[PDB]
Amino acid sequence: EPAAAPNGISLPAGYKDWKMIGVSSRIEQNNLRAILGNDIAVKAAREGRTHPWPDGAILVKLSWKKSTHELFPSAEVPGDFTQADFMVKDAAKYASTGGWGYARWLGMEQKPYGANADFAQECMGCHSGAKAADYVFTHPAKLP
Amino acid sequence: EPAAAPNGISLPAGYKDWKMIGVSSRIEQNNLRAILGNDIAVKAAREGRTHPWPDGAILVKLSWKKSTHELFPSAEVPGDFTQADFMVKDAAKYASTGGWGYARWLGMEQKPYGANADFAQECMGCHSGAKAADYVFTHPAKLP
Ligand code: HEC
Ligand code: HEC
């Protein structure tokens, strides 16, 4: 498997098979993103158990560069895979970063992100803004 | 159970638990979309067996109106759920519409779309542009 993140978090195996929580696009990143979760995170998302999210929930955000469909040029679609971002809920273990273990792996090569074991402070620079929602921006997409 | 589509196709049960094939955004629709598939479709997508897609593959496209995150205005995120669009592969049964059974259900109330049993001719009006790719536009997103 890929190397662990600098804070010791291992890449969750088989995350590409996880169920969908939502999707997004960031104007400044020129990307498309999928937000998936493990079974605990998906149950929590669906039942609104996000105040706080329960221990063991793992969220993944997958990002691709925007590209356009040759046969349909107004369709913005995934190009190159850029990264997999994770948040692992463990209120006690990760109390210093809002109860979440942050980790990122870059590209198809799955290179662990971060200069040192303190790298998650970057993530917290933005995710602190979402403190009222237990540090999670994503609102689970509505489905029947 | 939601009413069947005008061509007799029943709403696939449990589609929200299906694995991710990709995501998209249509500039003219002001939306965000997820593309999921049943496990027949997902295996085909991952192995590149999409010439043609195997019988029994079901693709679903879920659409939400774009909305912006209150805490991060440049993050385009799902608002209202607009529709679930399906293609069910059955080369023999749906030979008249490219080997796919098309069907759409609207909104959280899951109202079947289509004026009459011939509604899928609309879908074909665009999807015929993709005939050389077995009537499917989506290129499965790349993941490691
Ligand atoms: C999305 C994210 C997710 C999904 C959970 C969530 O909080 O919605 C993960 C697992 C993750 N990020 Fe964070 N991120 C930001 C925003 C606004 C969103 C929601 C909109 C969207 O889908 O794009 C996020 C913002 C930021 C940010 C501000 C510039 C930074 C610096 C980060 N994110 C950093 C990180 C991480 C540090 C390595 C990390 C593991 C993240 N994000 C995980
Ligand atoms: C996406 C779609 C999917 C996913 C499979 C695929 O072909 O990619 C389904 C199940 C579906 N649609 Fe079709 N559709 C169009 C385009 C360009 C894309 C790819 C880009 C994206 O993700 O947005 C599609 C185009 C059109 C179109 C041209 C204006 C029409 C009229 C339709 N689509 C119509 C239908 C349906 C008729 C009711 C139907 C069941 C569809 N699409 C299913």
Short mmCIF file of C-alpha atoms and ligand atoms in Angstrom, two decimals:
data_model
loop_
_atom_site.label_atom_id
_atom_site.label_comp_id
_atom_site.label_asym_id
_atom_site.label_seq_id
_atom_site.Cartn_x
_atom_site.Cartn_y
_atom_site.Cartn_z
CA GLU A 1 0.00 0.00 0.00
CA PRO A 2 1.16 3.67 -0.18
CA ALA A 3 3.26 5.06 2.61
CA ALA A 4 1.48 6.44 5.65
CA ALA A 5 0.81 10.15 5.98
CA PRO A 6 3.35 12.05 8.15
CA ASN A 7 0.96 11.83 11.14
CA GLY A 8 0.83 8.03 10.91
CA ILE A 9 -2.51 7.67 9.09
CA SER A 10 -2.60 4.76 6.62
CA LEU A 11 -4.43 5.10 3.32
CA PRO A 12 -7.92 3.55 3.75
CA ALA A 13 -8.04 0.44 1.58
CA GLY A 14 -10.76 0.28 -1.09
CA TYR A 15 -12.01 3.84 -0.62
CA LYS A 16 -12.92 3.93 -4.33
CA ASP A 17 -15.77 1.50 -3.45
CA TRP A 18 -17.26 3.77 -0.78
CA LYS A 19 -20.76 5.19 -1.10
CA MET A 20 -21.37 8.74 -2.25
CA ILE A 21 -22.08 11.58 0.20
CA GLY A 22 -21.85 14.44 -2.30
CA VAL A 23 -20.03 16.24 -5.12
CA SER A 24 -18.53 19.71 -5.54
CA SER A 25 -16.51 22.00 -7.76
CA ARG A 26 -14.10 24.71 -6.61
CA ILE A 27 -14.00 27.70 -8.93
CA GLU A 28 -10.43 28.60 -7.95
CA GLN A 29 -9.19 25.02 -8.33
CA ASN A 30 -10.76 24.35 -11.74
CA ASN A 31 -11.76 20.90 -10.52
CA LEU A 32 -14.50 18.40 -9.94
CA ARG A 33 -14.77 16.54 -6.65
CA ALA A 34 -16.55 13.53 -5.21
CA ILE A 35 -17.13 13.11 -1.49
CA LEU A 36 -17.46 9.51 -0.39
CA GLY A 37 -17.56 7.95 3.05
CA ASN A 38 -17.00 4.65 4.79
CA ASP A 39 -20.08 2.87 6.12
CA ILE A 40 -19.97 4.71 9.48
CA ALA A 41 -19.67 8.09 7.74
CA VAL A 42 -22.44 7.33 5.28
CA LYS A 43 -24.83 6.20 8.05
CA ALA A 44 -23.96 9.37 9.99
CA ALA A 45 -24.43 11.61 6.98
CA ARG A 46 -27.83 10.09 6.16
CA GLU A 47 -29.12 10.29 9.71
CA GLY A 48 -27.75 13.79 10.34
CA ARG A 49 -25.37 12.55 13.07
CA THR A 50 -22.85 15.29 12.39
CA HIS A 51 -22.94 17.25 15.67
CA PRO A 52 -20.44 15.71 16.07
CA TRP A 53 -19.65 13.07 13.52
CA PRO A 54 -19.12 9.70 15.28
CA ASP A 55 -15.75 8.08 15.90
CA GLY A 56 -14.72 5.83 13.05
CA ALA A 57 -16.35 7.97 10.33
CA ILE A 58 -14.00 8.51 7.40
CA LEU A 59 -14.67 11.08 4.68
CA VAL A 60 -12.78 11.11 1.40
CA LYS A 61 -12.71 13.91 -1.15
CA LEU A 62 -11.48 12.91 -4.59
CA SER A 63 -10.41 15.68 -6.97
CA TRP A 64 -9.87 15.74 -10.72
CA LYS A 65 -8.87 18.57 -13.03
CA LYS A 66 -11.79 19.79 -15.13
CA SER A 67 -11.72 18.68 -18.75
CA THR A 68 -14.33 18.94 -21.48
CA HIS A 69 -16.19 16.25 -23.31
CA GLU A 70 -15.12 16.16 -26.97
CA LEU A 71 -18.69 15.20 -28.04
CA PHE A 72 -20.36 17.71 -25.72
CA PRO A 73 -18.11 20.69 -24.95
CA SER A 74 -20.33 22.22 -22.23
CA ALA A 75 -19.95 19.03 -20.16
CA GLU A 76 -17.17 19.55 -17.62
CA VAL A 77 -15.80 16.12 -16.78
CA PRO A 78 -12.84 14.60 -14.90
CA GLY A 79 -9.37 14.89 -16.36
CA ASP A 80 -6.24 14.00 -14.40
CA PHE A 81 -6.71 12.70 -10.88
CA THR A 82 -5.14 15.24 -8.48
CA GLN A 83 -5.60 13.91 -4.93
CA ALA A 84 -7.48 11.97 -2.28
CA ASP A 85 -8.15 13.90 0.91
CA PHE A 86 -9.29 12.15 4.10
CA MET A 87 -10.70 13.04 7.48
CA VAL A 88 -10.75 10.23 10.07
CA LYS A 89 -12.93 10.93 13.10
CA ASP A 90 -11.33 10.09 16.45
CA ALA A 91 -12.34 12.69 19.00
CA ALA A 92 -9.69 11.77 21.58
CA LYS A 93 -6.84 10.72 19.30
CA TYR A 94 -7.09 13.84 17.10
CA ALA A 95 -8.39 16.28 19.70
CA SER A 96 -5.69 18.77 18.63
CA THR A 97 -7.18 19.02 15.09
CA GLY A 98 -10.93 19.19 15.83
CA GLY A 99 -11.21 15.47 16.52
CA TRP A 100 -10.29 14.63 12.92
CA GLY A 101 -7.21 12.94 11.48
CA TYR A 102 -6.38 14.72 8.21
CA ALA A 103 -4.40 13.08 5.41
CA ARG A 104 -3.79 13.57 1.69
CA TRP A 105 -2.32 11.40 -1.04
CA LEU A 106 -1.37 12.99 -4.35
CA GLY A 107 -2.18 11.74 -7.83
CA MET A 108 -2.22 8.30 -9.40
CA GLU A 109 1.16 7.81 -7.72
CA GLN A 110 -0.42 8.19 -4.27
CA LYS A 111 2.38 10.30 -2.78
CA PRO A 112 1.79 11.24 0.89
CA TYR A 113 1.35 14.98 1.36
CA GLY A 114 2.97 17.13 4.01
CA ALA A 115 6.38 18.47 4.98
CA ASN A 116 6.26 16.98 8.50
CA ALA A 117 3.98 15.43 11.12
CA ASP A 118 2.38 18.86 11.71
CA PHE A 119 1.04 19.22 8.16
CA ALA A 120 -2.64 19.05 9.26
CA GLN A 121 -2.33 22.58 10.69
CA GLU A 122 -2.73 23.72 7.06
CA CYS A 123 -6.01 21.81 6.73
CA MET A 124 -7.20 23.32 10.02
CA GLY A 125 -6.44 26.82 8.71
CA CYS A 126 -9.55 26.47 6.53
CA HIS A 127 -11.53 23.75 8.36
CA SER A 128 -11.57 25.85 11.55
CA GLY A 129 -14.04 28.04 9.60
CA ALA A 130 -16.43 25.08 9.67
CA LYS A 131 -16.16 24.59 13.47
CA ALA A 132 -19.94 25.06 13.92
CA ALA A 133 -20.40 21.98 11.67
CA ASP A 134 -17.74 19.85 13.41
CA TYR A 135 -15.08 21.08 10.98
CA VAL A 136 -16.83 19.58 7.92
CA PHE A 137 -17.94 21.84 5.07
CA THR A 138 -19.83 19.26 2.97
CA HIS A 139 -23.61 19.16 3.35
CA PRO A 140 -24.64 15.61 2.29
CA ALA A 141 -26.40 15.79 -1.06
CA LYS A 142 -30.14 15.22 -0.85
CA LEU A 143 -31.52 11.99 -2.32
CA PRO A 144 -34.88 10.25 -1.85
CA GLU B 1 -42.47 2.18 -4.83
CA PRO B 2 -42.26 4.96 -7.44
CA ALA B 3 -44.30 4.45 -10.58
CA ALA B 4 -42.56 2.79 -13.48
CA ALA B 5 -41.32 4.85 -16.39
CA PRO B 6 -43.58 5.07 -19.49
CA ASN B 7 -41.56 2.29 -21.19
CA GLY B 8 -42.12 -0.06 -18.26
CA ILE B 9 -38.71 0.31 -16.56
CA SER B 10 -38.91 0.20 -12.77
CA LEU B 11 -36.84 2.55 -10.61
CA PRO B 12 -33.69 0.53 -9.67
CA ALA B 13 -33.88 -0.09 -5.92
CA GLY B 14 -30.92 0.93 -3.77
CA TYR B 15 -29.12 2.97 -6.44
CA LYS B 16 -27.88 5.40 -3.76
CA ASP B 17 -25.65 2.59 -2.45
CA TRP B 18 -23.94 2.01 -5.81
CA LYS B 19 -20.29 2.74 -6.51
CA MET B 20 -19.02 5.88 -8.18
CA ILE B 21 -18.08 5.89 -11.87
CA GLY B 22 -17.61 9.65 -12.19
CA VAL B 23 -18.83 13.20 -11.73
CA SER B 24 -19.70 16.07 -14.06
CA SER B 25 -21.06 19.59 -14.33
CA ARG B 26 -23.07 20.96 -17.26
CA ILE B 27 -22.45 24.65 -17.83
CA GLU B 28 -25.89 25.23 -19.42
CA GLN B 29 -27.75 23.26 -16.74
CA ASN B 30 -26.07 25.02 -13.79
CA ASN B 31 -25.79 21.67 -12.05
CA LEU B 32 -23.54 19.13 -10.43
CA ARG B 33 -23.85 15.46 -11.28
CA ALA B 34 -22.73 12.13 -9.94
CA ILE B 35 -22.51 9.05 -12.14
CA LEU B 36 -22.90 5.75 -10.27
CA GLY B 37 -23.31 2.23 -11.62
CA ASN B 38 -24.38 -1.18 -10.43
CA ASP B 39 -21.59 -3.68 -9.95
CA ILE B 40 -21.98 -5.01 -13.52
CA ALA B 41 -21.44 -1.48 -14.84
CA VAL B 42 -18.61 -0.74 -12.37
CA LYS B 43 -16.68 -3.88 -13.31
CA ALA B 44 -17.09 -3.04 -17.01
CA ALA B 45 -16.02 0.58 -16.42
CA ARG B 46 -12.92 -0.42 -14.45
CA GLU B 47 -11.86 -3.10 -17.00
CA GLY B 48 -12.61 -0.88 -20.02
CA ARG B 49 -15.27 -3.34 -21.27
CA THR B 50 -17.51 -0.60 -22.62
CA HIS B 51 -17.50 -1.57 -26.33
CA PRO B 52 -20.21 -2.48 -25.76
CA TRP B 53 -21.20 -2.28 -22.13
CA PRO B 54 -22.35 -5.72 -20.96
CA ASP B 55 -26.01 -6.62 -20.62
CA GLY B 56 -27.26 -5.91 -17.11
CA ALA B 57 -25.04 -2.83 -16.62
CA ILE B 58 -27.01 0.06 -15.15
CA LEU B 59 -25.67 3.60 -15.12
CA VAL B 60 -27.31 6.29 -13.00
CA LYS B 61 -26.74 10.04 -13.27
CA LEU B 62 -27.86 12.13 -10.31
CA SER B 63 -28.28 15.88 -10.76
CA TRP B 64 -28.50 18.75 -8.27
CA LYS B 65 -28.83 22.48 -8.88
CA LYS B 66 -25.60 24.30 -8.13
CA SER B 67 -25.52 26.26 -4.89
CA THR B 68 -22.66 28.00 -3.09
CA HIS B 69 -21.32 27.15 0.31
CA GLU B 70 -22.26 29.83 2.85
CA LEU B 71 -18.76 29.56 4.47
CA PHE B 72 -16.73 29.20 1.26
CA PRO B 73 -18.46 31.03 -1.63
CA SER B 74 -16.22 29.61 -4.37
CA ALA B 75 -17.25 26.03 -3.49
CA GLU B 76 -20.11 25.05 -5.79
CA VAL B 77 -22.11 22.40 -3.98
CA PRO B 78 -25.44 20.55 -4.40
CA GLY B 79 -28.69 22.33 -3.79
CA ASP B 80 -32.05 20.90 -4.76
CA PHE B 81 -32.13 17.38 -6.19
CA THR B 82 -33.47 17.57 -9.75
CA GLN B 83 -33.49 14.05 -11.18
CA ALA B 84 -32.17 10.51 -11.45
CA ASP B 85 -31.40 9.36 -14.99
CA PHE B 86 -30.83 5.70 -15.83
CA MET B 87 -29.57 3.62 -18.69
CA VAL B 88 -30.17 -0.14 -18.40
CA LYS B 89 -28.16 -2.23 -20.88
CA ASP B 90 -30.07 -4.98 -22.68
CA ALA B 91 -28.80 -5.25 -26.22
CA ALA B 92 -31.76 -7.37 -27.41
CA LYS B 93 -34.68 -5.91 -25.40
CA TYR B 94 -33.70 -2.27 -26.08
CA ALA B 95 -32.25 -2.75 -29.57
CA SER B 96 -34.46 0.10 -30.84
CA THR B 97 -32.77 2.61 -28.50
CA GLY B 98 -29.10 1.69 -28.89
CA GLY B 99 -29.33 -1.36 -26.66
CA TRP B 100 -30.16 0.77 -23.61
CA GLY B 101 -33.34 1.26 -21.65
CA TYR B 102 -33.58 4.93 -20.73
CA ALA B 103 -35.60 6.24 -17.78
CA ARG B 104 -35.79 9.38 -15.62
CA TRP B 105 -37.42 10.10 -12.28
CA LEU B 106 -37.88 13.72 -11.18
CA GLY B 107 -37.08 15.22 -7.80
CA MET B 108 -37.46 13.97 -4.26
CA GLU B 109 -40.97 12.73 -5.13
CA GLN B 110 -39.54 10.44 -7.84
CA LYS B 111 -42.15 11.26 -10.47
CA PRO B 112 -41.53 9.36 -13.73
CA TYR B 113 -40.64 11.55 -16.67
CA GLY B 114 -42.05 11.31 -20.16
CA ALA B 115 -45.21 12.23 -22.07
CA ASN B 116 -45.70 8.70 -23.43
CA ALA B 117 -43.95 5.37 -24.02
CA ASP B 118 -41.82 6.94 -26.78
CA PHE B 119 -40.11 9.45 -24.44
CA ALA B 120 -36.64 7.85 -24.81
CA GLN B 121 -36.44 9.21 -28.38
CA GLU B 122 -35.53 12.54 -26.72
CA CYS B 123 -32.63 10.90 -24.88
CA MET B 124 -31.52 9.25 -28.13
CA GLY B 125 -31.50 12.69 -29.83
CA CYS B 126 -28.34 13.48 -27.86
CA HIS B 127 -26.98 10.02 -27.02
CA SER B 128 -26.85 9.09 -30.71
CA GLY B 129 -23.92 11.54 -30.81
CA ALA B 130 -22.12 8.99 -28.61
CA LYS B 131 -23.13 5.97 -30.72
CA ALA B 132 -19.51 5.00 -31.40
CA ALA B 133 -18.99 4.78 -27.62
CA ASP B 134 -22.08 2.58 -27.18
CA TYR B 135 -24.32 5.66 -26.62
CA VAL B 136 -22.48 6.55 -23.37
CA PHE B 137 -20.71 9.89 -22.95
CA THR B 138 -19.16 9.37 -19.54
CA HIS B 139 -15.49 8.40 -19.40
CA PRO B 140 -15.02 6.62 -16.04
CA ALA B 141 -12.96 8.83 -13.73
CA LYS B 142 -9.39 7.68 -13.21
CA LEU B 143 -8.41 6.44 -9.78
CA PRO B 144 -5.37 4.44 -8.62
C1 HEC C 1 -13.43 19.57 1.58
C2 HEC C 1 -12.69 18.57 2.30
C3 HEC C 1 -13.09 17.25 2.61
C4 HEC C 1 -14.51 16.74 2.72
C5 HEC C 1 -14.99 17.15 4.12
C6 HEC C 1 -15.47 18.58 4.31
O1 HEC C 1 -14.98 19.26 5.24
O2 HEC C 1 -16.37 18.97 3.52
C7 HEC C 1 -11.99 16.58 3.10
C8 HEC C 1 -12.00 15.12 3.56
C9 HEC C 1 -10.95 17.55 3.13
N1 HEC C 1 -11.39 18.72 2.67
FE1 HEC C 1 -10.46 20.58 3.04
N2 HEC C 1 -12.08 21.54 2.06
C10 HEC C 1 -12.23 22.87 1.99
C11 HEC C 1 -13.54 23.19 1.60
C12 HEC C 1 -14.07 24.60 1.58
C13 HEC C 1 -14.18 22.01 1.32
C14 HEC C 1 -15.65 21.92 0.88
C15 HEC C 1 -15.88 22.41 -0.59
C16 HEC C 1 -15.30 21.43 -1.57
O3 HEC C 1 -15.82 20.31 -1.69
O4 HEC C 1 -14.34 21.83 -2.26
C17 HEC C 1 -13.23 21.00 1.63
C18 HEC C 1 -11.19 23.82 2.21
C19 HEC C 1 -9.84 23.56 2.56
C20 HEC C 1 -8.80 24.53 2.63
C21 HEC C 1 -8.95 26.00 2.43
C22 HEC C 1 -8.13 26.65 1.29
C23 HEC C 1 -7.66 23.85 2.93
C24 HEC C 1 -6.28 24.40 3.14
C25 HEC C 1 -8.02 22.49 3.02
N3 HEC C 1 -9.34 22.28 2.76
C26 HEC C 1 -7.12 21.46 3.36
C27 HEC C 1 -7.44 20.08 3.53
C28 HEC C 1 -6.52 19.11 3.99
C29 HEC C 1 -5.09 19.36 4.44
C30 HEC C 1 -4.06 18.43 3.80
C31 HEC C 1 -7.25 17.89 4.01
C32 HEC C 1 -6.75 16.49 4.32
C33 HEC C 1 -8.54 18.21 3.63
N4 HEC C 1 -8.68 19.54 3.33
C34 HEC C 1 -9.64 17.34 3.58
C1 HEC C 2 -25.33 11.71 -19.19
C2 HEC C 2 -26.27 10.68 -19.02
C3 HEC C 2 -26.09 9.46 -18.28
C4 HEC C 2 -24.80 8.78 -17.92
C5 HEC C 2 -24.32 7.90 -19.08
C6 HEC C 2 -23.64 8.70 -20.18
O1 HEC C 2 -24.04 8.60 -21.37
O2 HEC C 2 -22.69 9.42 -19.86
C7 HEC C 2 -27.34 8.88 -18.18
C8 HEC C 2 -27.67 7.58 -17.49
C9 HEC C 2 -28.18 9.72 -18.94
N1 HEC C 2 -27.53 10.80 -19.45
FE1 HEC C 2 -28.17 11.90 -21.12
N2 HEC C 2 -26.38 12.90 -21.04
C10 HEC C 2 -25.95 13.82 -21.95
C11 HEC C 2 -24.59 14.13 -21.79
C12 HEC C 2 -23.81 15.05 -22.74
C13 HEC C 2 -24.13 13.44 -20.72
C14 HEC C 2 -22.67 13.42 -20.31
C15 HEC C 2 -22.23 14.70 -19.63
C16 HEC C 2 -22.87 14.86 -18.27
O3 HEC C 2 -22.52 14.15 -17.31
O4 HEC C 2 -23.71 15.79 -18.16
C17 HEC C 2 -25.27 12.66 -20.25
C18 HEC C 2 -26.83 14.48 -22.84
C19 HEC C 2 -28.22 14.38 -22.93
C20 HEC C 2 -29.07 15.16 -23.78
C21 HEC C 2 -28.64 16.26 -24.75
C22 HEC C 2 -29.28 17.63 -24.52
C23 HEC C 2 -30.35 14.61 -23.57
C24 HEC C 2 -31.68 15.03 -24.20
C25 HEC C 2 -30.16 13.59 -22.60
N3 HEC C 2 -28.88 13.42 -22.21
C26 HEC C 2 -31.26 12.82 -22.15
C27 HEC C 2 -31.23 11.70 -21.30
C28 HEC C 2 -32.35 10.89 -20.99
C29 HEC C 2 -33.76 11.00 -21.54
C30 HEC C 2 -34.92 10.99 -20.52
C31 HEC C 2 -31.83 9.92 -20.12
C32 HEC C 2 -32.59 8.81 -19.38
C33 HEC C 2 -30.47 10.17 -20.00
N4 HEC C 2 -30.08 11.27 -20.72
C34 HEC C 2 -29.54 9.47 -19.23
#
